[PDB]
Design a protein around this ligand. Sequence first.
Ligand SMILES: [Ca+2]
Ligand SMILES: [Ca+2]
Lengths: 65, 144
Amino acid sequence: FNRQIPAAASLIQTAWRCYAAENPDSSTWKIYIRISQLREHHRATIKVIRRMQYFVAKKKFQQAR
Amino acid sequence: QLTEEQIAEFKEAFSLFDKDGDGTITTKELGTVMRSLGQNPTEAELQDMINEVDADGNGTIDFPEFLTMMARKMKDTDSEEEIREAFRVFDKDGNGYISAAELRHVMTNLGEKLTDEEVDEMIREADIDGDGQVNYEGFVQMMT
Ligand SMILES: [Ca+2]
Ligand SMILES: [Ca+2]
């Protein structure tokens, strides 16, 4: 019943995680518990992946419309 | 639009995925990076991500594609309208506002499931008046 609900939330969530990652002291950087000390090469690949996941969540929201 | 330094920063980011050095990014290389961050993607997850960036459609990502994706103005490229309609799925019947408690429920328990600390940042920055009612139209602009 309404597939738009998950796709909508995921588009908001990915868009915000993409926006929050531009702030390097954001709480969004705490979610990687498996990384001992977060270095700059982690942050560079994290921003790329988050952008990729935003474009996917955007597509799936589009498809559910 | 783009500086010479941002392009160089994107070239270094491209090199971290392109472990082989052949100038393209495969689904297997993306899966290696993501697992190094504690993620556990599946082959469809990785192929979904690659298909959104692969222009030609060969299944691989070259640096022009990578740079095109990283430089997409995801603020004016008709994105604000879709995030707005995403909020409208849960909108308080037409309102244009969303309960801070309702936003926390959707952000924490649905979709990607953000952390409780992440929702605090989102609510605090989006609750301009501090009343527990966020207008997302204004929040969308802040993100963009
Ligand atoms: Ca490669
Ligand atoms: Ca390609």
